[PDB]
């Protein structure tokens, strides 16, 4: 149900020239069709001198290594659904010298050949998860006046930094959507000694992540600290699960009865946490 | 005297002796099954701090192993710890056996 | 014999015989090794549709 095409070339003029052995490995739960490989092998103008297949793992022995783009493809069938999304592996070994190999990575047709990481610096971090909370408690029925915001921030599942941020523009880098934006007020922080108003902060979210964030609006952001830093010095922060995002209402959106005394409670929380900070 | 220890059903790992930090790692736990019946088990790496799992957590993978055969499951975990991190994988079995 | 001296060191050789003394220092440097294959290069592309379980 899935088609494959391995491709091989050799730079040459090194002295290593000769036959090569391929170690292409399919995804989980796949296995190639023996008939297709046999048909490729049986031809007089043969490129696959020998083949062998046991489930996912398929070997390809090449008698001649072309210098330019000249390669061969086949087909594989699935029988068990894959439990995750990740790139797979593929390796080529020189026939007379297995040490001088070449490992290469490949991913799903709609996915990338590398994982989503933001490290880009001396420290390194990675960004797998479910990004968008897209929570608006005022327009729905789950909001309460109990005051669990402090519980969420300082007790469980615990939150590090505190900011309310006004969005400037929406940007996209690699598989990540960058939100260039301006700080309005600093609520709390753990390590950002440079925290202040009218500063530059960058918030990043995966492109696959279906979060919607309209530029020009003021959003409330709460989450765990990042470790990547911007190109101009400011620490950059990442959007993922356990990240709290909200859009505050307006006066016309706070006087109304379906959020009466709840929007005011949220503003009181914001002021109290900005002033007092966490307790116990 | 040769004291041959053998387990009828097992999983085998070979961690490369050197893995550069920040660089991509390919992890290949292979299933060995000498039983007489086809097994449908699950493979998942336990979520451990300091490592980015390919699935980023305890997400299971399903694969059926025919009798007297092997079935590998590819994993792509890039290290992010400082010096050394412990890693354990679980191959949990079905109700049939 | 091993020693732990991170600064300039002194020598006070004494003896009628003559010989050769050499010192080895081991440390890490800024890496420059290429991450791309140099002699043989393999690229594989997969096209089609893949079914997956409940994720994302």
């Amino acid at each position: 149900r899935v088609h494959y095409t391995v491709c091989i070339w050799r730079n040459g003029k090194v002295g290593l020239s000769g036959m090569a052995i391929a170690d292409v490995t399919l995804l989980s739960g796949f296995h190639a069709l023996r008939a297709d490989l046999e048909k490729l092998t049986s031809l007089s103008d043969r490129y696959v001198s020998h083949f062998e297949t046991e489930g996912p793992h398929v070997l390809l022995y090449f008698d001649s290594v072309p210098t330019s783009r000249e390669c061969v493809g086949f087909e594989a069938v699935q029988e068990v659904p894959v439990g995750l999304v990740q790139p797979a592996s593929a390796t080529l070994y020189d026939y007379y010298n297995p040490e001088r190999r070449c490992s290469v990575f490949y991913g799903a047709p709609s996915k990338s050949r590398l994982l989503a990481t933001l490290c880009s610096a001396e420290v390194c971090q990675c960004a797998e998860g479910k990004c968008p909370r897209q929570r608006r408690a005022l327009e729905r029925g789950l909001q309460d006046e109990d005051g669990y915001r402090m519980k969420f921030a300082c007790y469980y599942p615990r939150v590090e930094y505190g900011f309310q941020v006004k969005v400037l523009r929406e940007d996209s880098r690699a598989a990540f959507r960058l939100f260039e934006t301006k700080i309005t007020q600093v609520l709390h922080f753990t390590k950002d000694v440079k925290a202040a108003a009218n500063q530059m902060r960058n918030f990043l979210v995966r492109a696959s992540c279906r979060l919607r964030l309209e530029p020009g609006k003021e959003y409330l952001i709460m989450g765990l600290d990042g470790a990547t830093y911007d190109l101009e010095g400011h620490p950059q922060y990442l959007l993922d699960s356990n990240s709290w995002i909200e859009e505050m209402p307006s006066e016309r959106l706070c006087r109304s009865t379906r959020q009466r005394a709840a929007c005011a409670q949220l503003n009181d929380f914001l002021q109290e946490y900005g002033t007092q900070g966490c307790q116990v | 005297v040769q004291l041959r220890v053998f387990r009828e059903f097992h999983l085998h790992l070979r961690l490369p002796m050197s893995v550069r930090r920040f660089e991509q790692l390919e992890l290949r736990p292979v299933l060995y099954n000498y039983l007489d019946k086809n097994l449908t088990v699950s493979v998942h790496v336990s979520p451990v701090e300091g490592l980015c799992l390919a699935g980023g957590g305890g997400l299971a993978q399903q694969v059926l192993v025919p009798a007297g055969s092997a079935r590998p499951v590819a994993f792509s975990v890039v290290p992010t710890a400082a010096a050394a991190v412990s890693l354990k994988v679980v191959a949990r079995g079905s109700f049939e056996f | 014999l091993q020693f732990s001296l991170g600064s300039k060191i002194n020598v006070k050789v004494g003896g009628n015989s003559k010989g050769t003394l050499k010192v080895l220092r081991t440390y890490n440097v800024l890496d420059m090794k290429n991450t791309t294959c140099q002699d043989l290069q393999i690229e594989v592309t997969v096209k089609g549709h893949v079914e997956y379980t409940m994720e994302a």
Binding site: - | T40, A60, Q62, K88, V90 | -
Partner: peptide, 15 residues
């Protein structure tokens, strides 16, 4: 396709 629940109360780890 196929899918099934799996039982694991505890499995003796090897270290």
């Amino acid at each position: 396709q196929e899918e099934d629940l799996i039982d694991e109360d505890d499995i003796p780890v090897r270290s």
